[PDB]
Amino acid sequence: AMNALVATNRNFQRASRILGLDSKLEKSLLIPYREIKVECTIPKDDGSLVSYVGFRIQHDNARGPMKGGIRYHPEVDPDEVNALAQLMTWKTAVVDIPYGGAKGGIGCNPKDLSISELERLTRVFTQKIHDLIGIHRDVPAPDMGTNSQTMAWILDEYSKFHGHSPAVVTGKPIDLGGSLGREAATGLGVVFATEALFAEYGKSISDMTFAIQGFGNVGTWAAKAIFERGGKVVAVSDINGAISNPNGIDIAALLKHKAGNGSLKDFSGGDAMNPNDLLVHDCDVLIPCALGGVLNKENANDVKAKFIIEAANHPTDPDADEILSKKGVIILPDVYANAGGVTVSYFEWVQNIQGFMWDEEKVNQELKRYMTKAFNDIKANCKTHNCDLRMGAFTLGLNRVARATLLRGWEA
Amino acid sequence: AMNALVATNRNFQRASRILGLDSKLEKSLLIPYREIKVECTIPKDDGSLVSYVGFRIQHDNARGPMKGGIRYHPEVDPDEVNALAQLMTWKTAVVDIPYGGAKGGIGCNPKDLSISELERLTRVFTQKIHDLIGIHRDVPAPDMGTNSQTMAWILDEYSKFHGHSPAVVTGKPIDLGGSLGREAATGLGVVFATEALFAEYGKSISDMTFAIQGFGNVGTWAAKAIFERGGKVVAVSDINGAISNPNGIDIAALLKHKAGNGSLKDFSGGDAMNPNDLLVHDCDVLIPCALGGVLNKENANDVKAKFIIEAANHPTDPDADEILSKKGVIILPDVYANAGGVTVSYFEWVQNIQGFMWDEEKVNQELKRYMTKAFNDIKANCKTHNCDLRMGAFTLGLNRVARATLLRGWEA
Amino acid sequence: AMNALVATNRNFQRASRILGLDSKLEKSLLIPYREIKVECTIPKDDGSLVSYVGFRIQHDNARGPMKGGIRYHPEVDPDEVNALAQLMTWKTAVVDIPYGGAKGGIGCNPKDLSISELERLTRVFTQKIHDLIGIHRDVPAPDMGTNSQTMAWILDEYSKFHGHSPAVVTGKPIDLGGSLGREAATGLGVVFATEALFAEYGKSISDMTFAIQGFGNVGTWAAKAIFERGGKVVAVSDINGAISNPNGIDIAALLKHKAGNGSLKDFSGGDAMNPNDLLVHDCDVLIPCALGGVLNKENANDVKAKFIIEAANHPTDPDADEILSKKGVIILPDVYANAGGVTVSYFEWVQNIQGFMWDEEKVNQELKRYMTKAFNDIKANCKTHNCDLRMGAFTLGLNRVARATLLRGWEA
Amino acid sequence: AMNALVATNRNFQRASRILGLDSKLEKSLLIPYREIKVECTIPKDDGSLVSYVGFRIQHDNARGPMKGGIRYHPEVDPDEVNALAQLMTWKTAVVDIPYGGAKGGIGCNPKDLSISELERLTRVFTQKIHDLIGIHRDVPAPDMGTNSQTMAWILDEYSKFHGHSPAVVTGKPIDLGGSLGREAATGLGVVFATEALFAEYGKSISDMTFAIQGFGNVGTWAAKAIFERGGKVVAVSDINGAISNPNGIDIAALLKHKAGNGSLKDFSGGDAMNPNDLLVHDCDVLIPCALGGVLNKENANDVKAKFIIEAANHPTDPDADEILSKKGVIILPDVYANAGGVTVSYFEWVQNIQGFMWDEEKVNQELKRYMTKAFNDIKANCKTHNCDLRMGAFTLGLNRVARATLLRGWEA
């Protein structure tokens, strides 16, 4: 793959030149507000020590408290967390929620840690960054390798230092102040975004076949919402294998099978498939829901889809963007399509601060309102600048951050 | 009387066994988070010193900031405040408001103190606990022997240490950020709770006679709400005496007489009664609205009511529960029936942190909604466990607190 | 044994009557500033939970930050910690160090917990009281069942909440800011106190035989300091056994045996004896160095010593005091004789605050100066009030605290 | 040449291996406590923006508040700051002052910036890190490109956020709480260290010729102190040129020349010299006083000196260590030889806490005592481990840091 931060900076530079941003402002907007790397050392269950480095990149807070998840994944590194944090700054601005961008992570493999070890690691990480995050400062959330239980531990340990602070972290369990709809939000939002795009062509999800890479929090709920809107999901992969069915996979049955600890390749309602063949599978629509950088100069020519919906963060690098453009492929960008998560996190934060929770229908209605407005704004920018969808979104968010930055000023 | 904490712990033990709680979880849930006892010394108006001991027992905060009133009464002691604080943990969970449980108090008799002395004592108590309470930590309120003027002093003294903090205490005067409906909330909620129970029997308040022990914040508004629904209030007592009328007392006239500094025994619309005969008075419904432990093994066999509505905290001890069960008496438990006060306190707190107030119709509609949902949940819980109303409520709240506790976890 | 707080309060009342304190002042001085009880729950090494109640009693801060140790012992309870905290208030005032009194503890048996469990318990206790202690607020230290390693964990955990705070706790390891001389300070000060007393009779430590109950931090260093000054230590006990030698035990050899995990009853340089006979052993001087209340009305009549030096806190109850007085026994009281520990803790705190350390010769020279001045002040007070040594010291401390209290005043 | 952090980590691994440190302890000690990178953007005098990245690497605080300077230099980058911060941890431990290690910097070139721009940049950097530093947390100081005026601005800006905090930074101007002797301290300590080393051969500074690379705060005061001890300084260089005199340079005259804005090349008391030939000059003693890594695999074979005194931080990489060892060259390591600056910074910090300032002789005599004891400790370590001087110092410091770390423990 191309370096994640090289890739994201190329997109940033391209969006800057479209806006004609002042080069000094551009440099400021590139540099993160604050990068934090902390030692995270815990005792394992047997008493022996293990040490990790935890990252929290606080990229920009011009538009509000910083926002973005925490990734537990062995390939977490500073370039990846910096790219993801920068993308959070643009994404929060695309959907126009009052947040800036941050991201955190620990280079561990959760499969290799017991649940008590994962809890200790999460608490120690929180101890090491508690003074640098906060309800109006920087509010984490899940990402790959973390979930609502992880967020419970963050809330619990943070609150020892600062009092009960439900709004310090989102994606919480419902019974600890979480929001109805947040578990499903990213996948649902991907489908709202996809519906909005397809309507421009006079088409619907039910007209299309879909291939999905990754089957975790994003991939499961995306697949479910696609299936319920009549889409034909013809292939699904995850880290362990994959399953295909040209007639469409019964996603309801597939999810039930997964919840029983079944593996994709063993699902009886399709054919086991090599997961290394997922991205080049025949389909109308490809939805990467796992790692970034997976569409690159080596495989972009072999993509068969006419639409790519970026549910994962930065699945497509700029070399692939160019190849896929010349192939006639249309790419709905991450900073729009996957923003349902952070948008419903904003609603969770609002409910916590207000001391009163919303029903799930109100959460999703507001989510759809935000995704609809953002798409209309992206459309208008694409027309103004005669640019592609990625740049329509990137320039929309970049300009909103630039405006707030310029209003705040530069004197000491 | 039975020791209050022995009594309340016996009920906790019984509810824990119905739920099959793990014994180590049970032990943690019994132990208070933090017990605080502080010297409170003031100059009296003549300059001489008096020293009191103030309490704030913080029992459990798994479900949110702790909540519970402050009692000024001569029998305030550690066991009583611990029992009350534990009941707040279950009560907040029964009505499903995002609070844990706490309680405070001072062993004094307010009638013996001037209004300037009460103010000094209140401000000194606040000075001694300010660092332990807070909007998102522990939020007091009135109880026996305190009122909205007490809360105004707490607010005012607390705000010297932390800035304007209206949400630090509830039961405030309207002109200092209090909620419409809060003064009447506990007594009105008692009547909503009672109507909900009686509907299960195809009966209304207007079918019944009522005897009420105590005639302060809870007893007055309960009596008023009963009277306005056609209930016959045939006996009322307070510390100083009692009055009866088997035809029903004109509660509007009784309240006017009280407001004029009249004594119950002197009311011309009834007959003076020995207050010691109140609990055993001939009535359909007995509502204790004063001290706890007043129904016990020595008088329970003499109760004539078929319903007991626990407006007071813990008026019936476990020995009396058994005796009254064998008499066919139905007891609507404190942790449900009197939760209207803490419920509207939640609404007050919400109005304060949100910086915007509600009208009284909204307050009371939501109070009714919360009291109805809780009763319906208690009923279902009774069916699930084939248990009495007390255990239906106690297990409902205990289970919710256990669920939050287990999510939060145990590592340091 | 008499209740520890009943015993200590009887002494307080006796001293108050000697001074003629105003009854309202007296009542205020008795009541603790703040009593704290906190849940302390940890996972054991096998993951199962254990729950303890931790105590910090903050008795009085009129003269400065509160000071006193943390006891891990199965008989720790509120009465014991209240008595100990009150004694620290008088003791700090007897030696005229600028501290008030406090004490903490957990009712546990350290021998039944692994070293990792003891660390987690210590860290959780610190998390539960961190907001209540502080360099200028309340500074803990060791007591029975805790040591410098315990203090290292308190320092380390506290510093996560408040930054590096070496002066928040004393008795630290040298490599974490501890003071030279602090490990030996209580036993050495016992010897300085004893030498001051014996000079009044024209006697030396080398003239006397000694029996010592307890052989931990206080007993080992006391025995060593006596041995090195030619005193004959004829009996030593601990919780598992006892050893005697009428010619004097070779304490250097006894300590080496202890350091090799030997038991007292097995030491080859004496005869085994029943530890239940230690306090009635023939000797000139009896030094209790373990639990309180061990000299009581059931054994005081059989004591054979002419001098009792109270190294332990409150080893002699007031019934035993009277019996022993009538036997001609002279008792050098705890609040003077064992104050070397807290005095060198003061020096440790000063060194930490000043940022540089003293050598051991300077520590011990200053310790001797403090113990000499205190004894001279005690003698003077005994002459003024024609009272015994205990009351001379107790009234000296109580009067100093009363002075500071009256200067601070009582208005809000 | 070699990467600064690769180099320093090789030395750490070598010292770890000598000590036999467990791999899990070794890994923890390598990882910094906290790495911080912050945007520092200011308006230039003409109003146009410039943006820099500022660093504060907090490597280890086991032994106390972290300590280390701030470098303004165009080659400042994360690897350099990390290496320097790690060296501060070992250095502080070598001289046995109660500090851990940190370092900061900004990748600017001060010659580019006006004095008002340098002030704004320093103040903005302070605004960005004030929450990270503090009297008992992390105390900065000068380094390359900064001076006492830089420290005045840090103090002034920091104090807006936290009140007057003289001890938050050392190297301050004398008129704002600085210490006499601090300006000259690093160079004077270099000479104390050198005198101690040469005494092991029965030789003195006055027996040797010297070449000095760098002529700033370290190089000028090192040159002056060597000159005043009869040393023959035959060559001196800085960034702009160099000067040699085989008969010895009149350093007093050279320092007046420099104070007159003269360049080394113009000095009439010498012959101008290519500065690229400084390190290979014909001398007995080479003293690097500028950048790190200047002695490497490319030029170590060409060094003619028989002694290298490391005044600069990490002037010699491990490839050159091996080459020079083979040529019989003795290298006195940075973590010992240049520790006079941080030692007198410790004295400055103590004076600020004490509230009174020492005379210069007291400072320098105490500095000499610290440098003499450290050298004796190093020699003992070399003998114990049969290792070179660098490892004698590195293991002495590393062991002290390990010991404090192990005392503190690992549970959360």
Ligand SMILES: NC(=O)c1ccc[n+]([C@@H]2O[C@H](COP(=O)([O-])OP(=O)(O)OC[C@H]3O[C@@H](n4cnc5c(N)ncnc54)[C@H](O)[C@@H]3O)[C@@H](O)[C@H]2O)c1
């Ligand atoms: N969770 C959110 O709220 C959210 C929001 C927006 C975007 N995202 C992005 O969506 C992506 C997925 O996050 P998630 O929350 O679903 O993570 P998750 O940990 O819940 O699941 C990740 C899934 O990807 C699979 N996967 C991992 N490596 C793979 C590989 N090499 N090939 C195929 N499958 C692989 C895993 O097996 C699993 O099915 C990430 O890029 C994340 O940053 C997440």
Ligand SMILES: NC(=O)c1ccc[n+]([C@@H]2O[C@H](COP(=O)([O-])OP(=O)(O)OC[C@H]3O[C@@H](n4cnc5c(N)ncnc54)[C@H](O)[C@@H]3O)[C@@H](O)[C@H]2O)c1
């Ligand atoms: N106020 C609230 O919001 C609230 C909420 C829930 C439950 N409660 C409980 O309701 C009960 C009453 O509290 P309140 O707020 O009305 O107190 P209050 O001080 O306003 O009134 C107390 C009343 O009880 C009477 N009383 C006291 N001792 C009595 C005795 N021995 N016999 C008869 N009457 C006696 C007093 O004379 C007075 O009429 C208490 O158990 C309290 O904990 C109060």
Ligand SMILES: NC(=O)c1ccc[n+]([C@@H]2O[C@H](COP(=O)([O-])OP(=O)(O)OC[C@H]3O[C@@H](n4cnc5c(N)ncnc54)[C@H](O)[C@@H]3O)[C@@H](O)[C@H]2O)c1
């Ligand atoms: N450590 C201090 O600085 C300090 C200061 C002043 C006073 N004190 C008091 O000194 C006494 C001893 O404290 P320590 O620090 O030496 O404790 P420690 O835990 O170091 O040692 C306690 C000793 O007492 C023995 N002991 C326990 N129960 C016993 C029993 N039933 N019979 C005989 N011996 C028994 C133990 O076996 C052990 O030898 C306590 O009263 C303590 O409060 C301690």
Ligand SMILES: NC(=O)c1ccc[n+]([C@@H]2O[C@H](COP(=O)([O-])OP(=O)(O)OC[C@H]3O[C@@H](n4cnc5c(N)ncnc54)[C@H](O)[C@@H]3O)[C@@H](O)[C@H]2O)c1
């Ligand atoms: N200042 C202190 O207290 C202190 C303490 C210990 C060690 N050090 C180390 O000493 C070294 C010098 O620091 P300083 O305070 O003297 O810095 P400074 O900014 O005062 O002076 C640096 C000097 O080095 C010269 N120089 C720069 N680049 C050069 C090059 N390529 N070749 C030759 N000369 C060059 C400059 O011209 C100037 O003479 C650094 O490694 C620093 O980390 C400084």
Ligand SMILES: N[C@](O)(CCC(=O)O)C(=O)O
């Ligand atoms: N996974 C996310 O970080 C979610 C962030 C949030 O909910 O705050 C994302 O990539 O958007």
Ligand SMILES: N[C@](O)(CCC(=O)O)C(=O)O
């Ligand atoms: N009196 C109460 O404590 C009410 C508490 C509140 O309103 O917060 C009660 O007993 O419920």
Ligand SMILES: N[C@](O)(CCC(=O)O)C(=O)O
């Ligand atoms: N063990 C002590 O509490 C010592 C207290 C201290 O050193 O601060 C005591 O009993 O004096």
Ligand SMILES: N[C@](O)(CCC(=O)O)C(=O)O
């Ligand atoms: N220049 C230094 O950082 C000294 C810092 C200090 O004086 O604290 C160094 O490299 O030692």
Ligand SMILES: [Ca+2]
């Ligand atoms: Ca920026």
Ligand SMILES: [Ca+2]
């Ligand atoms: Ca508990």
Ligand SMILES: [Ca+2]
């Ligand atoms: Ca008191």
Ligand SMILES: [Ca+2]
């Ligand atoms: Ca480390």
Ligand code: NA
């Ligand atoms: Na274990």
